[PDB]
Design a protein around this ligand. Structure first.
Ligand code: ATP
Ligand code: ATP
Ligand code: MG
Ligand code: MG
Ligand code: MG
Ligand code: MG
Ligand code: MG
Ligand code: MG
Lengths: 159, 159
């Protein structure tokens, strides 16, 4: 919108994920297999998310990725936000996040790969511990988890 | 998700709007209060959108802006996409777009301001003429309109 000129900033990559909360306000997180190189790794945690195919709807991608990584069919409830990152080579990536809910009567069955060690529901209290411990890959996860808790009417994160 | 390092690219401004279609697949557009040119304003057209307050939900902003500019209460149906622009001074603006539908039993009553001349529903055929005529401010409007038509199962656009 509106008549103030601006140039286009091409975004080569797009990712879409979800902040999936269960009835208790626990968050579904995915753990990386291990850290790249040093000690005997111990992967960090992040929200279920993946690449949006070129031209495909980001919201649908978030739903698809969530199922592919956790085995759970989820329903997008509300868009929470998108943020921008830039890889060393200059490539831009726009990450999208939706507040989602799992369809009823499902069993968590993560897709173990060279990138995913497992996935699981983590309570607000333990999430606070993970965050303080530097175990949450992207700090934005805490920001969006907080947004989701507010949206659903759940208690805020202790830390 | 990912362990590949990337830097943060701050986005100072956020806008949110809608591709609002009625039952016939006509699109709701807003016209500028004349473009500055030579003797002639003749306003360009764009979808209803507006600024997202810092910290406010983008989706809710799209709904709010749509009502403020057209007088119509709309519901958000599905996220369509977001794209990035950069003003001459370097400021980045991320525009968000949702497919939306108006609540039933409403009357179009545009908010006339120094920025808005009027707003109205335009058919697919006339939209194509407007686009060919260079009267659509942001070409992305055509891209998203086409996305919306596909999502709703409406026939495609002549432009
Ligand atoms: N220009 C680039 N330079 C360096 N690495 C890149 C670039 N583009 C993408 N990546 C690599 O490709 C993958 C980027 O992720 P992609 O957008 O495909 O999906 P995603 O896993 O949902 O998002 P994220 O990039 O965090 O993995 C990165 O994990 C990284 O290894
Ligand atoms: N740093 C900046 N430098 C120059 N112009 C700016 C800057 N920030 C915002 N603008 C102008 O502000 C307006 C955007 O305001 P806002 O985000 O509220 O609504 P918008 O319609 O979504 O944005 P825009 O009209 O810019 O696409 C535009 O007219 C744009 O040119
Ligand atoms: Mg994938
Ligand atoms: Mg990608
Ligand atoms: Mg991802
Ligand atoms: Mg706008
Ligand atoms: Mg406004
Ligand atoms: Mg703004």
């Amino acid at each position: 919108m509106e008549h103030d000129e601006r140039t286009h900033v091409p975004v080569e990559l797009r990712a879409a994920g979800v902040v999936l909360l269960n009835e208790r306000g626990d968050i579904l997180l995915v753990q990386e297999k291990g850290i790249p190189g040093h000690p005997e790794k111990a992967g960090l945690w992040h929200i279920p998310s993946g690449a949006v195919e070129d031209g495909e709807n980001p919201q649908d991608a978030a739903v698809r990725e969530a199922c592919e990584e956790t085995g759970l069919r989820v329903r997008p409830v509300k868009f929470l936000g998108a943020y921008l990152g830039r890889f060393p080579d200059g490539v831009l990536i726009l990450r999208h996040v939706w507040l989602a809910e799992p369809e009823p009567g499902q069993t968590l069955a993560p897709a173990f790969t060279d990138e995913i060690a497992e996935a699981s529901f983590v309570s607000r209290e333990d999430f606070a511990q993970l965050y303080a411990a530097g175990q949450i890959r992207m700090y934005q996860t805490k920001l969006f988890y907080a947004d989701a808790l507010r949206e659903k009417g759940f208690p805020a994160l202790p830390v």
